[PDB]
Amino acid sequence: KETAAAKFERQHMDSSTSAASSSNYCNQMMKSRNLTKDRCKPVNTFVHESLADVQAVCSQKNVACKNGQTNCYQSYSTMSITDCRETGSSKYPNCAYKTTQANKHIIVACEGNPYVPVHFDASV
Ligand SMILES: [Cl-]
Ligand SMILES: [Cl-]
Ligand SMILES: [Cl-]
Ligand SMILES: [Cl-]
Incomplete structure (x- = not known):
């Protein structure tokens, strides 16, 4: 089973780009992170x-x-x-996503030792 911290990384982190590059970013990432399996x-x-x-x-x-x-x-x-x-x-299948880039505060739920993010709650 995936740990909660690892699941948060896989679903919510993309440190490899500074921002979505195009409208197809979400279709590509939702697939590669196995969120359309x-x-x-x-x-x-x-x-x-x-x-x-x-x-x-x-x-x-x-x-x-x-x-x-x-x-x-x-x-x-x-x-x-x-x-x-x-x-x-x-x-x-044929999942299809709208990509919306924004710069906002993030809100995450934290748990554990180390005390790290386990859920993405919202952005403001
Ligand atoms: Cl894992
Ligand atoms: Cl972990
Ligand atoms: Cl980085
Ligand atoms: Cl989310």
Whole structure:
């Protein structure tokens, strides 16, 4: 089974580009990160910063998560992110995604020792 920290890395980190390069970024990344294997994941955000900068958010502003848990943290700075969301013509397979690049604060839930990101809650 994948650990929660590893699953967060695979689903949410893309330190290899500074930003989505084109409209097809999401179709390509959602496929390569295996998020369209047995079903199309509906919504998924990739963060374009180093893994270290994203992990460091767990020591930044503590805020509530949408579900009410209190282990969420909001980055002090805005980060380059790309939101990937299925469009209307999307249908497993042939998943299809809209790519929206933005620079915003990220909110993640943290857990463990080391205390690292395990869920992406939202961006602001
Ligand atoms: Cl793994
Ligand atoms: Cl791990
Ligand atoms: Cl997400
Ligand atoms: Cl990096």
